[PDB]
Design a protein around this ligand. Structure first.
Ligand SMILES: Nc1ncnc2c1ncn2[C@@H]1O[C@H](COP(=O)(O)OP(=O)(O)OP(O)(O)=S)[C@@H](O)[C@H]1O
Ligand SMILES: Nc1ncnc2c1ncn2[C@@H]1O[C@H](COP(=O)(O)OP(=O)(O)OP(O)(O)=S)[C@@H](O)[C@H]1O
Ligand SMILES: Nc1ncnc2c1ncn2[C@@H]1O[C@H](COP(=O)(O)OP(=O)(O)OP(O)(O)=S)[C@@H](O)[C@H]1O
Ligand SMILES: Nc1ncnc2c1ncn2[C@@H]1O[C@H](COP(=O)(O)OP(=O)(O)OP(O)(O)=S)[C@@H](O)[C@H]1O
Lengths: 579, 182, 325
């Protein structure tokens, strides 16, 4: 009776059509059967990554028995799935759980046709460093009795073997593999009617294909038999939800949207409104960043290329921004994040300006087991796992120690980067921007505005002297920022003045600066340092205007709508009815 | 319970996952202090107002304590019994019962083992829907060790709401504070 | 018995199928159809694979290579195509990011950490992969960046396949292939004195190797292999290959080429992408810069839905099918 209380009759579940129909995996199913067909230690075990179909194989075998597709040894056999229930019943009256366990084995053992016992999470039976693990399945399997099928993960197997020894002897591992995308789809097709029936939705074959493809590309941490199903099942659920208050059909687009929600990857949304945003991306960035159109275009291409799906799945977009300091290198990256997340600071930043090798590698990746801290991934690993397509910005990669840059070297080509604790993170479908001021050395030759021939040669000469080709050749594009022209300065001043207004927390403490009057000319004239980019503008605005404004505010001379003009420098007005 | 403001996508996504045939176990993930458990209660409120997908229409949502795990361990195995009991009561399906586990990493177990089948193979059967809640750090401490949980549960990213959203939230909660403080 | 063992260990060596004979005696043919030129590297690998598959390989020496060459010459690529062949899946490869192998961590990262210390997740990458997939190809990217202490561990691994784990177990990764890559000789290959790396230049490369790795390691590699700089002719073939891969990776295959200019475009790219010291990488870049980016706009603008055509611009451009929908 024990067997009916502490285990599930998997062959009955197969008989009743409750188990997912099993598709493919013939070598694996066959191997399990062949091992069960053994006489001594007829004890197979399915080992492999958590999502590859281990119990599906077991269920498959249950079906093969029901379907009369087994050896005469197995024909007429019954398969049970052992629960922990026998053990959960309690260790009250010391050893009784072992007796119940033994009772299960005894019922099985006494020739009630051939009974095979299967155990989920079988590593649990390694018990208390042996001891409580008792004789669980030990003399049983040793004598070839009580045929057992076990299944667990790679890591658990490692723990079983390591800690027990004897179990390794008793069990015959069978490796189970993740199916290919094509195989995955075939499986999905096989499962399709169960999903369609459950949800009450129709699934197009295109959708099934789509899910497997997307799963391979966008759910790297979880194996295809699961990941593809999550996309199918969830997409179906999506449709099922629509059916609650609103065409019950799942297609590739539904899945792609679902994937975007699931993974955070915006590439899969596919909207007409997106198209307009991307088409005019350059305009929007040019209204934030003045000039530097080549840089704007360079990035825009990365985004558009990625959003179209054309970007190579293994080549994170990668840019190196060379250019004269203050030309807007960091600023561009921020504005790109602005565009992509509606948040200039959403991006992941790596302050490479601070990277002495000894520490630098570990700061980005973290430690291996056994070292101080296991809170791995200071910056790259931890951030990449939650914001997998975000903009990753490296400030002054030029100054990073040459060795830490080789972490980036790897990151930049074929996604993979691994944590200190051993996980592949894979910064794949994302954008990487790196910065350097190295090129300033030649740009400051004042060769007009747009970078000229020779200037660019020297800039690239220097970058070649500084970084090894191994790195440079992995960059999608090296962009050299242009010098800002006085004309650019006029545009910049406008933008800056607008940002100043927008950032005011107190919506009264703002200007009506006569920026249409000589005030803009003053700023453009005085702030145009040929070689400090736009930075002098921030300083002039503070020295010429905001500092004075602060005083006007402190003295309560200001309510709102402050105005500015120039005398002989910038001068602020007061509101005449004030002190 | 306090009302939930915004977070519509989170509520929708959570339920959508619960609507799944198998492994219908969403988990909220994000930095602490962002409203993860608020979302969970938001779902409870949608259930009370019944503004939910068919699968939840008349469903219950329970928050599991660790008392199930820890309230006495003489007669080792009793906590396992507590879980088989609880999980069985959920499986009973008097109505649809969804279980919420706060601090979901707490069921990881000391070197697993204790973890038993607490919410393990059962989740793949379509019953015992579980909603989790964790942080990036906790998540890593579960996932990198269990493997199977990473598969069983489906994380949902939960963003820090923007300042704009924050204000809306504050307005929404304003009367609770005004009433409490007077 | 042999077949049974193959089933249990996964090792194809023991299957002995006739169909393998053709794939193996022609492995070079097929690798050369993926990797252009670089025949010595191709032969080097194929010989190792064949010794294993034919049952001649010595169990105490995992096959190993040290591939030297210019970046963009196909070092990583070859290894992947080989893994592709061996498993019918390039993702089966076990990879090591050697650039991450700073002294204090690298050993423990690959082998694991000893009992008593935080985390017993031994095996990080090597033990954990090797204990399940015995004949996986290992790939070490830029081994010259690994701290010498790490390279020392490889020396141990490269004989008897014996590697100890952090917790004291052995791996015995006998029947496998180990690929190490390096850019140390790039400085001499860049002399461009030839097509096939020239003799003598070859010794300069050995010089770079000998001054970086200790001899104790170097004489242990089954063979040190040097990739050739790519020739212009190679580039023509490479371009063709990339264009095919590009079409193949279009998972949403409405987005596909007819390409057109089936000579002219390829020649344009071959001409412009033939950078003497950057291997094939510039070809990838030109295609994105000159073609795919433009395609992205044609897609975004609803100008092209399928049947993509490239024209020469006297650069290159794409022709609109639907009229800007
Ligand atoms: N070949 C297949 N045939 C039928 N169903 C499959 C197949 N592969 C996967 N599935 C489904 O997707 C899952 C595959 O993995 P499962 O066996 O459920 O999980 P697992 O691989 O057993 O890992 P554990 O041991 O349960 S953590 C199953 O739960 C099935 O629902
Ligand atoms: N081309 C530009 N358009 C608009 N604003 C700009 C531009 N260039 C610089 N700025 C201003 O420059 C400031 C930030 O410049 P950054 O990009 O940080 O300096 P940089 O160009 O990165 O040089 P480094 O490397 O950071 S010294 C912002 O306050 C911007 O307003
Ligand atoms: N969107 C929201 N609508 C209404 N109230 C909210 C919202 N977000 C947060 N709150 C309130 O803000 C508080 C913080 O939320 P919590 O869920 O406690 O934080 P948390 O994200 O759960 O952090 P942990 O993980 O539980 S420490 C909650 O107590 C809610 O009452
Ligand atoms: N001979 C070749 N035939 C075909 N493709 C090639 C060839 N050489 C290089 N490639 C391409 O180069 C890219 C992969 O880079 P690799 O050439 O392996 O870089 P590498 O040669 O490994 O130098 P490292 O060590 O990775 S910097 C792929 O896009 C390959 O297709």
């Amino acid at each position: 009776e024990y067997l009916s209380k502490y285990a599930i009759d998997m062959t009955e579940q197969a008989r009743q059509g409750k188990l997912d129909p099993v598709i493919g995996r013939e070598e694996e199913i066959r191997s399990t059967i062949r091992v069960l067909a053994r006489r001594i230690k007829s004890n197979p075990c399915l080992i492999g990554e958590p999502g590859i179909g281990k119990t599906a194989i077991i269920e498959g075998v249950a079906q093969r028995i029901i379907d009369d597709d087994v050896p005469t040894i197995l024909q007429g056999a019954k398969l049970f799935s052992l629960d922990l229930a026998a053990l959960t019943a309690g260790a009250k009256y010391k050893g009784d759980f072992e007796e119940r366990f033994k009772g299960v084995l005894k019922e099985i053992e006494e020739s009630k046709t051939l009974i095979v016992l299967f155990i989920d999470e079988i590593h649990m039976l390694m018990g208390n460093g042996k001891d409580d693990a008792a004789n669980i399945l030990k003399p049983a399997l040793s004598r070839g009795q009580l045929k057992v099928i076990g299944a667990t993960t790679n890591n658990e197997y490692r723990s079983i073997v390591e800690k027990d020894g004897a179990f390794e002897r008793r069990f015959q591992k069978i490796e189970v593999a993740e199916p290919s995308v094509r195989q995955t789809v075939a499986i999905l097709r096989g499962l399709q009617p169960k999903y369609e029936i459950h949800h009450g939705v129709r699934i197009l074959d295109s959708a099934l294909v789509t899910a497997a493809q997307l799963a391979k590309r966008y759910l790297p941490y979880r194996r295809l038999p699961d990941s593809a199903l999550d996309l199918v099942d969830i997409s179906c659920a999506g449709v099922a939800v629509a059916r609650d208050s609103k065409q019950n059909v799942v297609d590739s687009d539904t899945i792609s949207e679902t994937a975007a929600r699931l993974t955070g990857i915006p590439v899969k949304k596919l909207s007409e409104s997106e198209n307009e945003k991307l088409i005019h991306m350059e305009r929007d960035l040019s209204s934030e960043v003045v000039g530097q159109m080549d840089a704007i275009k360079a990035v825009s291409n990365a985004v558009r290329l990625s959003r179209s799906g054309l970007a190579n799945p293994r080549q994170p977009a990668s840019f190196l921004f060379l250019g004269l300091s203050g030309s807007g290198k960091t600023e561009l990256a921020k504005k790109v994040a602005g565009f992509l997340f509606n948040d200039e600071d959403m991006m992941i930043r790596v302050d490479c300006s601070e990277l002495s090798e000894k520490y630098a590698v570990s700061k980005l990746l973290g430690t291996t087991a056994g070292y101080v801290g296991y809170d791995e991934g200071g910056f790259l690993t931890n951030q990449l796992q939650y914001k997998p397509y975000s903009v990753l910005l490296f400030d002054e990669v030029e100054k990073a120690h040459p060795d830490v840059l080789t972490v980036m070297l790897q990151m930049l080509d074929d996604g993979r980067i691994t944590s200190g604790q051993g996980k592949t993170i894979d910064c794949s479908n994302c954008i990487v921007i790196m910065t350097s001021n190295l090129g300033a050395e030649f740009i400051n030759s004042q060769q007009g505005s747009k970078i000229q021939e020779s200037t660019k040669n020297l800039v690239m000469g220097a970058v070649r002297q500084h970084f090894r080709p191994e790195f440079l050749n992995r960059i999608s594009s090296i962009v050299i920022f242009n010098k800002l022209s006085r004309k650019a300065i006029h545009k910049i001043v406008d933008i800056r003045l607008k940002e100043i207004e927008e950032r005011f927390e107190q919506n009264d403490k703002h200007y009506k600066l006569n920026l249409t009057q000589e005030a803009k000319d003053f700023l453009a004239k005085y702030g145009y340092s040929d070689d400090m980019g736009a930075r002098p503008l921030n300083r002039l605005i503070q020295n010429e205007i905001l500092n004075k404004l602060a005083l006007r505010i402190l003295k309560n001379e200001i309510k709102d709508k402050e105005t500015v003009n120039v005398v002989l420098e910038e001068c602020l007005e007061v509101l005449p009815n004030h002190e």
